[PDB]
């Protein structure tokens, strides 16, 4: 059985925990409890392969990002998440890409750009704008909703498929 270590990063409140919990536990977390560092593990069949997913849910709030670098070190793939109704979270994606490059000491790390909360209508980040950012990094852009489940499996499974190409 193959093991894939995934790490979810991004600004505070963009929905990292809700996305992970929807994927793993199949329910939507409506409340906002800031994360320090949590991990989830689950066996799933992806494209015919039985594998073990180890997902690290990291802190987005600066005050709670103590040794985030250390926890991310073993990550093999990263979901860089921003919220489509939070322009600042989109503009700060570069901060996370930089951190990933540092922790992995590589400019070629499996990643997927995720625009979460696509169920909301106060959109300030248009799809095309995010597609362009992802293109510059040479990675896929996928929109998700931890609330409706739209694109959730697609985002995580795509990250696995990206790890498989590296
Ligand atoms: N409508 C909607 N709300 C969402 C979505 N994802 C998350 N939220 C809401 O946004 C708030 C923060 O989500 P949460 O998953 O805790 O964010 P986080 O990125 O994990 N925050 P932190 O970095 O501090 O740990 C919660 O109230 C949650 O319900 C989504 O896709 N749609
Ligand atoms: Ca609570
Ligand atoms: Mg969280
Ligand atoms: Mg605009």
Measured on CA atoms in the order 74, 53, 77, 11, is the torsion positive or negative? Answer: negative
Q: Is residue 111 within a helix (H) or strand (E), and if so which, with residue range?
A: strand 111-116
CATH class of domain segment(s) 1-166: alpha beta
Experiment type: X-ray
Residue linked to tokens 């995720």: 114
Q: Is residue 82 within a helix (H) or strand (E), and if so which, with residue range?
A: strand 77-83
Helix (H, G, I), strand (E, B), or coil: what is residue 104? helix
Ligand 1 contact, 16 CB (< 6 A):
yes
Ligand 1 atom at minimal distance to the Cα of residue 20? 15
Tally Cβ neighbours within 10 Å of residue 120: 13
Distance 6 CA to ligand 2 centre (A): 25
Residue linked to tokens 């625009």: 115
Give the largest CA-CA distance in the chain. 42
Buried b (16+ CB within 10 A) or exposed e, 57-81: bbbbeeeebeebeebbeebbbbbbb
Stated in angstroms to one decimal place, the resolution of this structure is 1.4
Instruction: Give dist(CA 66, CA 101) in Å, integer.
Output: 18
* Residue spans per domain, the chain: 1-166
């Amino acid at each position: 059985m193959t093991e894939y270590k995934l790490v979810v990063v991004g600004a505070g409140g963009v929905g990292k925990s809700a996305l992970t919990i929807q994927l793993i536990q199949n329910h939507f977390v409506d409340e906002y409890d800031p994360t320090i560092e949590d991990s989830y593990r689950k066996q799933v069949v992806i494209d015919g392969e039985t594998c073990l997913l180890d997902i690290l849910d990291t802190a987005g709030k600066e005050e709670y990002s103590a040794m985030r670098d250390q926890y991310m070190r073993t990550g093999e793939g990263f979901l860089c998440v921003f919220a489509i109704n939070n322009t600042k979270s989109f503009e700060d994606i570069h901060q996370y890409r930089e951190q990933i490059k540092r922790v992995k000491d590589s400019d070629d790390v499996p990643m997927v750009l995720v625009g979460n909360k696509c169920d909301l209508a106060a959109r300030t980040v248009e799809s095309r704008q995010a597609q362009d950012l992802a293109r510059s990094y040479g990675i896929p852009y996928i929109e998700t909703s931890a609330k409706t489940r739209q694109g959730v499996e697609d985002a995580f499974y795509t990250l696995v498929r990206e790890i498989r190409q590296h």
